[PDB]
Amino acid sequence: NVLEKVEELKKEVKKKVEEVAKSSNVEAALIKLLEILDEFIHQVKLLPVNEENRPILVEILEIIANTAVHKARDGAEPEFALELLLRLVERFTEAVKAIGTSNEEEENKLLEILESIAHTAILLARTLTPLEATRALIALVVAFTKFFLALKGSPEKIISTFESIARDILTFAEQKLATVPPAVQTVLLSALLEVIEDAREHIVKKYG
Amino acid sequence: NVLEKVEELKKEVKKKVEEVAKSSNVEAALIKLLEILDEFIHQVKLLPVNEENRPILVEILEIIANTAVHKARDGAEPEFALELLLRLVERFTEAVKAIGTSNEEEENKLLEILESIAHTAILLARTLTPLEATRALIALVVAFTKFFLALKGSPEKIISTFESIARDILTFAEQKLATVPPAVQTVLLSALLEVIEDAREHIVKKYG
Amino acid sequence: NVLEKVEELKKEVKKKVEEVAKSSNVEAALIKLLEILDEFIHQVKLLPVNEENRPILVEILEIIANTAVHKARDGAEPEFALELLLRLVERFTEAVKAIGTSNEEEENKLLEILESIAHTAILLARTLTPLEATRALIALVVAFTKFFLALKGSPEKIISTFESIARDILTFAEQKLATVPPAVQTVLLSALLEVIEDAREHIVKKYG
Amino acid sequence: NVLEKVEELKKEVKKKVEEVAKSSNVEAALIKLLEILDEFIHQVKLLPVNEENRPILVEILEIIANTAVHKARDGAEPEFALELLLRLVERFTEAVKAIGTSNEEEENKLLEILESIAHTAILLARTLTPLEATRALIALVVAFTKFFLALKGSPEKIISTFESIARDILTFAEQKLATVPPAVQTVLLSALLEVIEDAREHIVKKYG
Amino acid sequence: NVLEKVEELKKEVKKKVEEVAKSSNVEAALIKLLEILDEFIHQVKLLPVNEENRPILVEILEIIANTAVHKARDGAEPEFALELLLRLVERFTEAVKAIGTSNEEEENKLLEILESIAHTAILLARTLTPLEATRALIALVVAFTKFFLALKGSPEKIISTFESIARDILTFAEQKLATVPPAVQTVLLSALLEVIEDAREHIVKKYG
Amino acid sequence: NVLEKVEELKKEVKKKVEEVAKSSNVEAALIKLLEILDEFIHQVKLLPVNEENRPILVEILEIIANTAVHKARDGAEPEFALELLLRLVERFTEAVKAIGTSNEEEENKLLEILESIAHTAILLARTLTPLEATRALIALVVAFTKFFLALKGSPEKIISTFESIARDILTFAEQKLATVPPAVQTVLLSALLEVIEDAREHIVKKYG
Ligand SMILES: [Zn+2]
Ligand SMILES: [Zn+2]
Ligand SMILES: [Zn+2]
Ligand SMILES: [Zn+2]
Ligand SMILES: [Zn+2]
Ligand SMILES: [Zn+2]
Ligand SMILES: [Zn+2]
Ligand SMILES: [Zn+2]
Ligand SMILES: [Zn+2]
Ligand SMILES: [Zn+2]
Known part of the structure; x- marks a missing residue:
């Protein structure tokens, strides 16, 4: 039944993740993991999703996300890893959209996946x-x-997580822009603040 | 009569604007607004324009402009979105040429539309x-x-608005060029001053 | 007997190789070498092949391959030389298929022919x-x-040689793609990794 | 037998190394040693490797490494030399992978080769x-x-060598970052500590 | 006798060179000098060549070469001029093959002609x-x-001239590649050194 | 004979040097002296060199070197002048290699040319x-x-001059790094000492 197919997906994704993780040259690993995430998104889309099979899909997504984040963090040319992480974020957005929403624990797992992605991308940049x-x-x-x-869920957690991510982004901006003449500080900092304020305004209107 | 068809145009443009605004991937949104603006320009050009129907056309154009400006600001690759903004500016010029000129309030609406476009494009750049x-x-x-x-209208408003826009352009250039060796400062700043002076000279010759 | 015909083939191929090597305008040299390889393959297919005459045929093939590789390396339009190299390796496949398999030393000679061809083609590209x-x-x-x-032979040597060739190709691709925006890096790399993985999978299956 | 081929490889590599070492314009020399190392790794991969021929291959590798390190140190544009050293490190990593592991003395030679490479790269940077x-x-x-x-070998030697190398890297980072505002100190130093800790965690987990 | 025909050829080539040199639009001038060189090659091949008429033929060739080089340098699209210069080099190679070899002074004239061609082509590229x-x-x-x-002649002059040309090419490449990321310099410089080394190997083996 | 051609070269180089020296905008002057030195190197290489014509070539080189050094000292952007001086050093090295070695007085002239070049370089930096x-x-x-x-000659003069140049460079370094925090003093000074020590070691090996 549903359990059998979900467990087969679990096993296949697990073997592929192990194989790609074992490998060297992390960029090829990133491409392979992106393709695995794509085929998994397709397989999930085909299968009927209910409340029963949600936790297993969520933990499979968590495994993929941890493996990809660790591989990206394992060292490479920063700009390449940055675009790979952006594509990973977009595919993960598609994945959470396809999965649906459920008990709060899975949402916590997704949020911590998001936060680890943010930390890794800041670390790379x-x-x-x-x-x-x-x-x-x-x-x-x-x-x-x-x-x-x-994402769909209780507004408080989403708003708090977004605000925290915003705080890390702003703090890193203040750290990094210190090595430029303050005119460039004004320029780049104003751009970043405006874009982050626009993001905040949307999230507030949507989740208000 | 005129009211019926104008209100029908209002309704269709409103529905299309809502639908495109809801969508993600802002670049396709800008493409869709460009095509909507083109077809709306066509429809207005076809219909006979009088003083009675001008405010409704003006507010439809304002809706289009606000939606496009917000979508462009919502984040994308700056160069692509800014080229889209330039194309939107050209289409808006065609639209205002088609509309004609009337009581000052509209003209104020068009001027602040221009202002929002300029600020958003400077922000992108x-x-x-x-x-x-x-x-x-x-x-x-x-x-x-x-x-x-x-544009046609009172000389003072046009001249003042253009001088204001010129001041924002010059201030932004002064901010941004500060990160380069002063020779490139001289080069780029001289180019910008000369082109802006030519623009001022034409506006003065034609519109004074 | 067999020695007489094999040595006659040796002499004729040697003279033709000398004459073509002496000439300039390398493209005609590669064309003539391809025609020589075709007549040689037909002659070999006609003659009965045994373990006694294999080394002489192998060294004749090695002479032809070294001459062709050197002439191709001697300078020409890269794309035309790449086409000639592709035709050459195809005819060489047919040749090794016709020859059969024997003591390991001849297989080593063929493998180092292949590897020199790979190096020359990478150098040209x-x-x-x-x-x-x-x-x-x-x-x-x-x-x-x-x-x-x-090719038929001990799996370990073939797998190791293929892995080394794949790593050479990957290193060169990583070098060359550095001069493009990283999105093109992603595109071209992903294509290369996927095709190389397909090749690896087949060779592993069929030599498993 | 094996001795004859190994000694022939010794002689050929020796002559090529002498000829390239005699030459000027160290960048061309580095390219030539890279190509020599590539052909040597190919030849070694082809030949069957046993415990008898390991020391000669290791000392050939040591000759190549000393020549390349000395040539890189002999003066050039630092950044180009850094990428050349990185490529040499990758190729020689594949070389030691192909060689296999043996009596401790050869491992000591490889480790001191690595350490000299690290010192030269730090000195260039x-x-x-x-x-x-x-x-x-x-x-x-x-x-x-x-x-x-x-690499494979005794745990203590590898762990101690990596820790010492990390300490040299950290000491140089501390010395160099003194000429910047402390915010950039924080940024760059934190990045370096994080990447070096990731390296330590892998080595410990995989190899402990 | 031979003197009469040689002097008639001198006069005809002189007049044609003057007329083409006077003209503008340098590309048609280069085409005209190419056709003149071809017809002169045919005429020389027809005539019997002896030691008596060699200097006049050599100075005619020098006149043609100086005129063509000056016209090519006089400014045009670089790629078109490079193509024309390569065709000119090939035709003049056929010409010197037809001429034969003689007293050292004419060989020095041909060598400085080649040097000027190399300098002009480098300057164009x-x-x-x-x-x-x-x-x-x-x-x-x-x-x-x-x-x-x-060419035929004393080996020392040929080897020294080739080495000097190689050093000029290397210096110019070291200038030009400085504007690209170091991977690109690695790639292109390695190609250039390898092709120049192949050229050196041939000239050394052939002319040693 | 030899005197005639050598004196013609003397006159031509003299006129070109005077003409370029008269001109302002020293960067173009350095470019012109570089091209003159290159063509002079070619001309010397073509001509047969003997002990009879060496002094005239040496004094021509001295004229060129004094003119170039004076022009470089005459004021320009320091980094551009430094690169031009390095290119001049390489070209003059090629020139002296072409010239050969002779009576000690010409070697003294070359050494003092070298020393003046070094002083000008330090003064510019x-x-x-x-x-x-x-x-x-x-x-x-x-x-x-x-x-x-x-260079070839008596070891004592070469070693003494190199040691004196090393002392000059070291004294200038102790002057210049006085205005930095002592950590940067350590870093840059250690780099300088290591490089100059490697240079000394080679000189001792080769010339001992
Ligand atoms: Zn897909
Ligand atoms: Zn890791
Ligand atoms: Zn239209
Ligand atoms: Zn928005
Ligand atoms: Zn060749
Ligand atoms: Zn290779
Ligand atoms: Zn050294
Ligand atoms: Zn001209
Ligand atoms: Zn030159
Ligand atoms: Zn002066």
């Missing part, structure tokens, strides 16, 4: 030029805004 | 390389010069 | 556009997969 | 801007993590 | 994209290798 | 940032090491 870091950060914030719009 | 920023800004100034050439 | 380089490399790896499937 | 230097150092430590994963 | 410059220089090196193989 | 000054000095000492390897 830590070593770029100020302008490139600004571009990566604003695009990444837009991606999180799209995700938070897609 | 805030996070580019200095050379690409200068290209975008000079093209933008050319587009606004064309628009101000097209 | 070194100086093209990224997309054209991707096309050349993907066609090349398809040809190598066909060869490795065709 | 000594004269770069802080951000670049950080990028070069993190990429280099990722390469060393890959190597230390690849 | 000075203003191209790095990849296109690499293609132009590799084609140039192939053409010079063909010429140096064709 | 006197007004740069500490890191840029370090890069200029390291590249420059590498170039002088290459030259000293190239």
